Amino acid sequence: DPFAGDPPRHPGLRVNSQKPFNAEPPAELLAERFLTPNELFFTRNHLPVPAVEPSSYRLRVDGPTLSLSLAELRSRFPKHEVTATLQCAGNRRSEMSRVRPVKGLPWDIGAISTARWGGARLRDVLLHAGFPEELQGEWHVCFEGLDADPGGAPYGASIPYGRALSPAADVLLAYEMNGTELPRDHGFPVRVVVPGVVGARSVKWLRRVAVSPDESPSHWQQNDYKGFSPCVDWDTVDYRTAPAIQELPVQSAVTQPRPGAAVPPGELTVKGYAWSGGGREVVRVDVSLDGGRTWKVARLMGDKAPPGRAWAWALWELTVPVEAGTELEIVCKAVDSSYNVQPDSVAPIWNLRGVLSTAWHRVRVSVQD
Amino acid sequence: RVNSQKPFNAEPPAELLAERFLTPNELFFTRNHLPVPAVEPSSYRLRVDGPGGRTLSLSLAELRSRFPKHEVTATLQCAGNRRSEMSRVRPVKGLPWDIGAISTARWGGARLRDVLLHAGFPEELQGEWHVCFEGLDADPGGAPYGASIPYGRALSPAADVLLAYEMNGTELPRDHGFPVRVVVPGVVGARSVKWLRRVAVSPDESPSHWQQNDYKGFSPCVDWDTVDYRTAPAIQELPVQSAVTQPRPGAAVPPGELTVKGYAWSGGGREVVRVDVSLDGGRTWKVARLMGDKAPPGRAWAWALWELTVPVEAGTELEIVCKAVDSSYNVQPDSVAPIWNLRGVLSTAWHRVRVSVQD
Ligand SMILES: Nc1nc2c(c(=O)[nH]1)N[C@H]1C(S)=C(S)[C@@H](COP(=O)(O)O)O[C@H]1N2
Ligand SMILES: Nc1nc2c(c(=O)[nH]1)N[C@H]1C(S)=C(S)[C@@H](COP(=O)(O)O)O[C@H]1N2
Ligand SMILES: [Mo]
Numbered sequence A: 001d002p003f004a005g006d007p008p009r010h011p012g013l014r015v016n017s018q019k020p021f022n023a024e025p026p027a028e029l030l031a032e033r034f035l036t037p038n039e040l041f042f043t044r045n046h047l048p049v050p051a052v053e054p055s056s057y058r059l060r061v062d063g064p065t066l067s068l069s070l071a072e073l074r075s076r077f078p079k080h081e082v083t084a085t086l087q088c089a090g091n092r093r094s095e096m097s098r099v100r101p102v103k104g105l106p107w108d109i110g111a112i113s114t115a116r117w118g119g120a121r122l123r124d125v126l127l128h129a130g131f132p133e134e135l136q137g138e139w140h141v142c143f144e145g146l147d148a149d150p151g152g153a154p155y156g157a158s159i160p161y162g163r164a165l166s167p168a169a170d171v172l173l174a175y176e177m178n179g180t181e182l183p184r185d186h187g188f189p190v191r192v193v194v195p196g197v198v199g200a201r202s203v204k205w206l207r208r209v210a211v212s213p214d215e216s217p218s219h220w221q222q223n224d225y226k227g228f229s230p231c232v233d234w235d236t237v238d239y240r241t242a243p244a245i246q247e248l249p250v251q252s253a254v255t256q257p258r259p260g261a262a263v264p265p266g267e268l269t270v271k272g273y274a275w276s277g278g279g280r281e282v283v284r285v286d287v288s289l290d291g292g293r294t295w296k297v298a299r300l301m302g303d304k305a306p307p308g309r310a311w312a313w314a315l316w317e318l319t320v321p322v323e324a325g326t327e328l329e330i331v332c333k334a335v336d337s338s339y340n341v342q343p344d345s346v347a348p349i350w351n352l353r354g355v356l357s358t359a360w361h362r363v364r365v366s367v368q369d
Numbered sequence B: 001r002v003n004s005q006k007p008f009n010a011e012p013p014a015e016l017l018a019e020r021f022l023t024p025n026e027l028f029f030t031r032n033h034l035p036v037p038a039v040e041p042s043s044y045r046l047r048v049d050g051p052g053g054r055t056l057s058l059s060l061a062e063l064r065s066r067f068p069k070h071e072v073t074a075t076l077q078c079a080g081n082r083r084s085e086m087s088r089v090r091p092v093k094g095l096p097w098d099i100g101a102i103s104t105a106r107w108g109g110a111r112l113r114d115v116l117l118h119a120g121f122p123e124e125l126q127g128e129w130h131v132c133f134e135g136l137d138a139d140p141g142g143a144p145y146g147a148s149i150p151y152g153r154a155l156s157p158a159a160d161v162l163l164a165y166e167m168n169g170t171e172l173p174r175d176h177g178f179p180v181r182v183v184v185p186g187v188v189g190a191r192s193v194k195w196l197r198r199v200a201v202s203p204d205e206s207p208s209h210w211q212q213n214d215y216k217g218f219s220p221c222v223d224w225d226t227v228d229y230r231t232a233p234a235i236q237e238l239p240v241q242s243a244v245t246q247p248r249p250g251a252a253v254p255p256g257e258l259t260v261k262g263y264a265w266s267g268g269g270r271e272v273v274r275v276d277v278s279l280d281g282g283r284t285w286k287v288a289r290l291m292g293d294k295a296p297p298g299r300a301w302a303w304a305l306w307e308l309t310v311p312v313e314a315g316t317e318l319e320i321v322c323k324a325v326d327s328s329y330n331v332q333p334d335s336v337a338p339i340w341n342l343r344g345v346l347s348t349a350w351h352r353v354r355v356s357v358q359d
C-alpha cells in the first residue's frame, strides 16, 4: 500500500476516492464560513501524499540554480498573504454524468474551497534567481511536485511567465494556509497557489520551479484538463486541439436548501457561492424558484476586492416567501465583471472528462403544508 | 442597414459583414448619439490634463509626428449588437440592431500610454483611477459624449489603447471620429470615444450620462420602474459572442453541400478557441474551422471568422446554431430570456438561423 503513509482526514468529508485520497466537504458545511476551515477544504490528490521532513526539504529553482530550504523561503522573502478560492476543473462533474457517462472523480458542488494563503511571492523568488521581470515571446514557469507515478514522473503544471512575474497576479509559494502551516494533504511544506486559475496548476509539495520557452510537458498539462466540443468522444479526442485550462469561467451553486428537501411554508432563505476566474468579480447572482422562468437578485456577502483581483468567491443569500404545498425548482446563475454568464443547460457543454461544468445549478424542493 | 438617420446609425448587410477579415471603411458599422462634428484639422487641439501631469494641447500634426505610430487590428462591438433577439422576448429600449453592430479595422495612432507618460503621469497609480474622454459632439444644452476606462488599462502596454488617426490605412473617416478617436481594444464600443477633444486623468469614473446611466447589465426581473444604474458596473470588457452570417434566415438552400459561415469574438483580449455549429437546433454539434492568424496571448482583439461545410439533404429543415468558447473557457448561453434586460444590451445567447433545403 503506497498510501499507507497518507495523513488522517476529517470524517465529515464526502470521500470520492480513498487511494489516492479525494474528498469534498458536504454541501451543508461548504459555504458556512467565507474561509473554508483547513479540515474541510476539498482535497484532490492524484498520487500518494509525500512525507516530507521539513529540515532537509529543498526547493530547486533552475535559474538562467537555487536550492532553498524552508527556513530560507520563510526568511529571505517578504511574506505576502492572498485570499483565493481553488476550484477543481471537475467541480460539478456529477451534472455531466447525468447527460452521458464521463471519465473522472464524481464531484458534486464542493470541489471548491477558499483560504487565506501566506508565503513568498513567486515573482520575488524568480527575481532572486536572476530572471528578468519580463521576457519577450511566450515563456512559461514549470512546477514539479514531490509526488510521483510508478514510472517516477512527478505531478507537474505550468503557468505563463507573465502571470508568474506580475505583482498583481498574487502567485504565491505558500507555506501557510488559514494562518497555520500547510497541512500535508494541501502540500506541506510548500505549494504553488495560482489565484484565478484552475486548481490543477496549484502544484503541491513543490520540488522544482523552472523557466521554459514551452508549457510543462507533464501529462496533466498536455493530456488532461482541457475543454472539447460535446461531439468529441474517446476515439476522436486530440489534446493538441485545445488550450490547457488556466482561467476558469463564471460559476455558482446552491448550498441551501438541498435537493429533495421539504421546506416549511412562509419564508425560505436560499444560499450558495459564486466565483469567476482571472480575478473577475461576481457582479450579480440571479436566483429563480420556478426553474429559471423568473428571477430575483441575491444579496452578495463579503468585502469588495480590487479590480482584476477578485480571487475569492462571493457567498450569496436570498430570503423569499414560499407557499405551502408547492414545488420549487431553485436555480442560481452568476454574472462576472466582463458580463460573462452561465449557460442554461449541460448537454451543450458536455465533454468526455466532465470538466468545466458551469450550467445552471438546479435544486428541487417541495414546500410543506 | 440604417437603424436611425438623425442621429445616424447603421450596420452592414449580414451578407457582406464577415466576407473580409478587415471591414471596409464604407461598411464599418456607425453609431452616433449626436450630430457629427465638422472638425477643421489645423485648428484642432487635443487637450490632455490631470493631477500630476503636464497639460498638453496637441495638434493633429503633433499627435502624428511626436508619438511613434502603433497599429492595432481590433474589433469594435456595440453593446446593442443583436438587440433584435432581445426584442423577440420582450420589447426593449434601443437601436434595433441585428448581427452587424460589430466591425473590424486596422487602427493606427499614438498609444494612449505614450501620450499620458509624456504628460508626466506615472505608469501606475494606487487606488482606482480613471482616464476620461470627451468628444466634440454635443447635445443642444452642450454636454459632450464621454466615457472612461480604468487608469490601469490606459497605461498598460499590452492593452493597446490607441488615440487613432488612421483606419484601415487611410485618414479616420468623419463618421468614425475624424481627426482622432480613442480605440479601446477588447472593450464595448461605447468607450471608444470619437472626435476626441479631451483626455483627463481622474479619481472617479466619467460623470457622463453614457458612463453613469447607460450601458450596464441588469437582471431580467428589472423593469423601468425599478432600474437603478448604481447597482451595476459600467460595461467594459464584453462576453464571448458569435453569429451566423451565411446562410440567412428563411433561405432555401440547394441540396448537396452547404457552407455555413460567421464570426466569433470575445472581450478582454481572450481568443476564441472553438466554435461549435449545429444543424438540428442545438441537439448535436460539429466543430467549425477558424480562419486567420493567431494573436499573442491576451491580445486577441480581432474577431475570428469561421466556416464549416456540411452535407445537406433535399427537402429537409435545418436550424443552424453557433456558439463560441474563449481562452478562459467562457461560453454562450442557450437562450435569451434569462439574459433579457430592459435595454436589450449584452445579447450573446446562441444565434439560431432556420433554413430549408430544396426541393
Ligand atoms: N503535486 C500535486 N499538486 C496538485 C495535485 C496533485 O495531485 N499533485 N492536484 C491538483 C489538483 S487537480 C487540484 S484541483 C488542486 C487541489 O488542491 P487541494 O487538494 O489543496 O484542494 O491541487 C493540484 N495540485
Ligand atoms: N463622441 C462619441 N463617440 C462615440 C459615440 C458617440 O456617439 N459619440 N458612440 C459610441 C458607440 S456607443 C459605439 S458602439 C462606437 C461606434 O464606433 P463606430 O461608429 O466607429 O463604429 O463609438 C462610440 N464613440
Ligand atoms: Mo483539479
Ligand SMILES: [Mo]
Residues within 6 Å of the ligand: B031, B077, B078, B079, B080, B189, B190
Ligand atoms: Mo455602442
